């Protein structure tokens, strides 16, 4: 019998994306070829399959760094990581193959199934 | 608020 | 020109609060009279006045323990902790005053409005 | 996914 607020989780991400843009209580750096992105692990585990993974597991739960595989590009990252802070991904020509990739290796499932709607209508 |  | 997943922000809130239940990533507790409640520092943050204020301290950012005003009933704050992972209040008769005034200490303003809007009809 |  509980009452509900509409725009709470809404209000809740927009909150820690605040955090992120201050850099307040981050607790990992993702490294991306030379780039480095600082970002909240429990936000990362709640959009991620892999980083849900790696910070499960009792040795990963640990490190401050982590380090993504060589192939995955920088800013196909970034826009990933601003989709995950705030439910809108800047998805443009040039970047949706690398959006796309990014978005399997990083395991967000609902982020593949609309890339692959968009390369199919072009 | 809504009755969810 | 970005698109936007509805339902994100309502899935990293559910996903953080399955991380809460499995004690997964909780970096406080939280004190009230004898009872303790384990939380995400990020998640209290995004949700509360009181705890923006505390983690956001350069000293207190550091805590793993924050005891409450003994005046804090357990009950009200459990119900506003499940509220913050859920965005469902439970509301009733028997709890509402120890719901408000809790809601009041950690400076939520919604559920304020709600809990005044709800005792002046009755 | 919606034009938001
Ligand atoms: O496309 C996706 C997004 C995603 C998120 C998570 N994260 C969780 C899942 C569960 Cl059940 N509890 C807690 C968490 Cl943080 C796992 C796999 C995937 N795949
Ligand atoms: O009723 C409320 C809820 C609330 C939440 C927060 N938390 C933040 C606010 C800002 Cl601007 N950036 C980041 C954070 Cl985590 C502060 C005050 C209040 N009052
Ligand atoms: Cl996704
Ligand atoms: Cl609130």
């Known amino acids: 019998s509980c009452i509900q607020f509409t725009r709470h989780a809404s209000d809740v991400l927009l909150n820690l994306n605040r955090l992120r843009s201050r ?9 991306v070829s030379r780039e480095q992105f ?5 936000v990362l585990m709640a959009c991620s399959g ?10 990963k739960c640990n490190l401050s760094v982590i380090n993504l595989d060589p192939e995955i590009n920088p800013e196909g990252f970034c826009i990933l990581l601003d989709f995950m802070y705030t439910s809108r991904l800047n998805l443009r020509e040039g970047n949706i193959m690398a959006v796309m ?22 | 608020w809504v009755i969810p």
């Open chain 1, 101 to 122: 990739a990014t978005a399997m290796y990083l395991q967000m499932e609902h982020v593949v199934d609309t890339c692959r709607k968009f390369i199919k209508a072009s």
């Open chain 1, 50 to 59: 892999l980083f849900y993974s790696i910070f499960t597991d009792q040795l």
């Open chain 1, 23 to 31: 850099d307040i209580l981050t607790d990992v750096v993702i490294v």
């Open chain 1, 38 to 42: 600082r970002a909240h692990k429990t």
